[model samples]
Target: MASLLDKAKDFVADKLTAIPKPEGSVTDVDLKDVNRDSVEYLAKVSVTNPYSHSIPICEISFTFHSAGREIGKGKIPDPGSLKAKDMTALDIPVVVPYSILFNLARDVGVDWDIDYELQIGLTIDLPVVGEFTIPISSKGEIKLPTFKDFF
Candidate 1:
């Protein structure tokens, strides 16, 4: 059982690397940019049933943070909510805008001085099979274009 779980964890880690991160900034910290006007990112998360004797119930959890501080957290009630019986990939689009993160950064003072890390917690429950937490780190970072230039 432990061996199967180890393989599953490896599979998830490989898949997470392909997930894209957000880029661009609403304000310039050098110019005193403190407003996160628009900041959003998309990610796809999926799990598979690889056991021949046991069925798997995959549940994904989301945790957002900046510089090791928590900003927001969420969980997917049903992993199969939008997935087909034989599906192996789930494109979970996560939209996190600057407007939302900026305030959190403000409260936590994570503006321009520290590096922010967005953490995701993944849990897979098997009927009498046990469960585990999948640890994931951030991928590439995308810098959003400033809207000031449009004016």
Candidate 2:
């Protein structure tokens, strides 16, 4: 049997773990554009803040990969804040240069699309928690634009 103090400690721990922070998910990841120098992809993220006051975002970091190789990665510095008690939408852009495209040429040529994986770290500043991160990961095939799209 557990001691009285131990039982009380468990209750406190459960409450801490239940603290409502923020929740988020990646709505979608798709091709944004194609340029001579590089290709651009966009990720749509939706985050809902449970706090009554707005929370400032520290930073957003993204790591993207395709065919077992990293294609693009970047960070958005001090972007902005999420609205209190509501959902906010965030757009993250990843630009993969033509040089890197060449590396995954085989995958690109097969289906005119790239099988991909992405990691998104949404860092926000909370009152008591300091910096909190809501991580989102989503993976799927993104199509390549044709020459007509370039025009």
Candidate 3:
């Protein structure tokens, strides 16, 4: 009886591990807009779904960190669904107020840019497999917009 139960568990584990899952990446992070109150940065993500049918996205959560501090964080509930057997593109916006930017002047003075790490969590409901989260992260430097670029 014990041997039979062990074989059944192994089979189940193997089947679950063989399941095809979604994959994603942070394609780019760039300046989206500049406002009197805050500056907005956009993070572009590309997700590929291997399933034959569309999958519903539960939520999308993101956090942006600069100079070892969390500058922005947000969540998008029920953003949408992924295209079946295709790639889906998403944009996550992070806004930082001028006040916060002023606080980081020391770091910006050194490099003329903000060293940042953006972390994103994409939660999706998969068939048979309840819920799965695809985590994506990117680290880079974002240059401040100059007067020339504004015009």
Candidate 4:
């Protein structure tokens, strides 16, 4: 009887794991704004929900690194929810102070850009699975604004 119950549990677990789940990706990361004190970058994420009902996003955590150093890290709680059977786009803002950007002058001065890696965690509340995290990461270079861009 115990063996039978164990097999049943395994079967149920397998079925649950087979259920279609949400999928997501980090679409783009770009410089959004530059201020005297800090530079702001926006990371765009696209998430597709397979369920017919909307799913609530618990939180979004992110880390931004440049030139082998962490420039920014933050978390957004209860940002919102994913549309039912649709794609949702979210913008995660990262702010790096002039102090940090100034330290990367060598890389920016040489290439006129800063190489960065962004790691993001999209946490959602699922019915049976509880909290699930979809990890997304992207690596790229962001061009520093020149005086010409201000005009």
Candidate 5:
């Protein structure tokens, strides 16, 4: 009886560990545009679905930080879904006002650019497993984008 119970427990444990989840990561973050009033940064994320079917995205929640302070937070609700058994790239737009940027003048002074870290929670719905959140993070130095490069 003890051996039978142990075998049953091991079987269930294996099934739990076999649960498939989508893989994702923060690919890169870069400066998008800048104006008199504010600046924009675009964060890129790469996600791969292990499932055979597409998964519906619930939301993408993100927070931007610079010089150990919060700059701004953004939410993209129902942005879309994961491609079926494939990979996709997500673009997250973050706009920080001049008021906030000037506050961290010292950080910019060091390199003539803004240094930042961003974290995102990508929530998606699975077939039978309900909703799951894949965490992604990235940090980098963003240089101002010029009009010459924007076109």
Candidate 6:
């Protein structure tokens, strides 16, 4: 049997299949100077069962990597379902300051107008497993949208 974290990683990989990369640009200087070489990005992750079933997600661990190098890692210690009984939105706030990401980009020669991808893998333990990956590009400014009652 695979561990919950392992299963979550697999789930993330599966959902990430063929997902498009985000479009944005983060100045080399901004990535190297401002934000002190680090930034944070957040997303809402939710899970639900088809045919009307009740399943809950207990915890979530996230690891972010770019160009085959680890950039950021975090654990949600304890994660719970939304207050609403039936919902598909779990707002997860993740911080990835430039200080932590600049070196990786520098090592890979990341610069303006270049398309770079950040791979985020999520792991959770709930008897059942769930994981997914997100691909985002560097941007001078990041605008995170809020999804409420909206799919």
Q: State the C-alpha lDDT per candidate.
A: 0.41, 0.61, 0.60, 0.62, 0.60, 0.38
Compared with the true structure, what per-residue lDDT tens digits does model 6 show for residues 7-71?
A: 34544654532212231111121121233434655544543322133334434454555445554
Instruction: lDDT for model 4, please.
Output: 0.62
- TM-score for candidate 4: 0.70
Tell me each candidate's RMSD, in Å, in order: 11.2, 6.7, 6.4, 6.1, 7.5, 12.1
lDDT of 4 by residue, 1-151 (tens): 1112223352365455322434563677776555666777767767665556677765667777776676677877764477876778877765766566666645564557767777766565654344566666667876754434331
Off by over 4 Å in 4: 1-14, 17-22, 50-52, 84-86, 146-151
TM-score of each: 0.44, 0.68, 0.68, 0.70, 0.67, 0.44
lDDT of 5 at 42: 70
Would you give me the overall lDDT of model 3? 0.60
lDDT of 4 at 24: 61
Tens digits of per-residue lDDT for model 5, 1-151: 1112223352355453222444663677766555666767777766665567777765667777765675567877754476876777877765666555555534553445656777777565654344556666666765534433221
| Reference-based TM-score, model 6 | 0.44
List, residue by residue over 31-67, the lDDT tens digit for candidate 2: 6555677878777767666566677765667777775
Better of 4 and 6 by lDDT: 4
Please give the lDDT score at residue 66 for candidate 1: 49
Per-model clash counts, in order, read 14, 0, 0, 0, 0, 15
Model 5 spans > 4 angstroms off: 1-14, 17-22, 110-114, 144-151
